[PDB]
């Protein structure tokens, strides 16, 4: 909650200034962070899903919710009900502490890191990014793992527009560009 305290003291005052909001509840704030691994290859074996959930349980200290197919499609050879991915919803202090470890440790551990995109805010403030490789987190041991996974991060905030979330993450020095 270190960044939550930095939010509550300096980000709200900053955004109230740079938007001239009437109320303090009108400010944006982060709400949840969603960590998906779409594992479409677990129809080959359950152990790839079962081990990908084990790695992401190490990243964020929660047991992931194993997601399944909403319906059946044949182009991917899947039926309605197959476990096909895993997700983790992060809220509260565990959200802030993951977001600290993210922007402080893991984003610098990206190979050839050169910035993020400011064109990934889904028109309504919610930001979504995707990492190529789970080894950027130091929770994962490099010798111990075998398969390169990948996940995607979805920061859901209460900003109505796209720029109010862009200014919010920039207030958290989120490395856009």
Which of 83, 94, 158, 161 forms a contact with other proteins (CB under 8 A)? 94
Q: Using H for helix, E for strand and C for coil, what is the string for 93-129? A: HHHHHHHHHHHHHHCCCCCCCCCCCCCCCCCCCCEEE
Q: Which does 104 bind (CB under 5 to 8 A by kind): RNA, other proteins, none?
A: other proteins
Distance between CA atoms of residues 30 and 96, nearest Å: 9
Structure tokens at 55: 């790695």
Contact present, 140 and 55 (Cβ < 8 Å): yes
Choose one: 5-13, 20-28, 146-154, 165-173; the region binding RNA (CB under 7 A).
Answer: 146-154
83 lines the binding site for other proteins (CB under 8 A):
no
DSSP state of 25: G
Please enumerate in sequence order all residues whose Cβ is within 8 A of that of 56, keeping only pairs 6 or more positions apart, or say none.
Answer: 35, 37, 64, 86, 88, 134, 149, 151
97 lines the binding site for other proteins (CB under 8 A):
yes
Residues 6-35 that bind RNA (CB under 7 A): 34
62 lines the binding site for RNA (CB under 7 A):
no
Q: Which does 100 bind (CB under 5 to 8 A by kind): other proteins, RNA, none?
A: other proteins
92 lines the binding site for RNA (CB under 7 A):
no
Distance between CA atoms of residues 175 and 118, nearest Å: 9
Choose one: 68-76, 77-85, 110-118, 121-129; the region binding other proteins (CB under 8 A).
Answer: 110-118
For RNA, the closer of residues 16 and 161 by Cβ is 161
Q: How far is the CB of 136 from RNA (least distance, A)?
A: 12
59 lines the binding site for RNA (CB under 7 A):
no
Which of 128, 145, 172, 176 forms a contact with RNA (CB under 7 A)? 128
Please enumerate in sequence order all residues whose Cβ is within 8 A of that of 105, keeping only pairs 6 or more positions apart, or say none.
Answer: 137, 138
| Nearest of 167, 174, 169, 123 to residue 18 by alpha carbon | 167
Structure tokens at 95: 């959200």
> Which residues make up the interface to other proteins (CB under 8 A)?
57-59, 61-63, 94, 97, 100-101, 103-105, 107-109, 111-115, 135, 138-139, 142, 173, 175
């Amino acid at each position: 909650a270190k960044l939550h305290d930095y939010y509550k003291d300096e980000v709200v005052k900053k955004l109230m200034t740079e938007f001239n909001y009437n109320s303090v509840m009108q400010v944006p704030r982060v709400e949840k962070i969603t960590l998906n691994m779409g594992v479409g290859e677990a129809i080959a074996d359950k152990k790839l899903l079962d081990n990908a959930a084990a790695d992401l349980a190490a990243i964020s200290g929660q047991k992931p919710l194993i997601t399944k197919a909403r319906k059946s499609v044949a182009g991917f050879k899947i039926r309605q009900g197959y476990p096909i991915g895993c997700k983790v919803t992060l809220r509260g202090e565990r959200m802030w502490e993951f977001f600290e470890r993210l922007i402080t440790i893991a984003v610098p551990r990206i190979r050839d890191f050169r910035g993020l995109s400011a064109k990934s805010f889904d028109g309504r403030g919610n930001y979504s990014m995707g990492v190529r490789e789970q080894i950027i987190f130091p929770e994962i041991d490099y010798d111990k793992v075998d398969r390169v996974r990948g996940l995607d991060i979805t920061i859901t905030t209460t900003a109505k527009s796209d720029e109010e979330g862009r200014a919010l993450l920039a207030a958290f020095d989120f490395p856009f560009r």
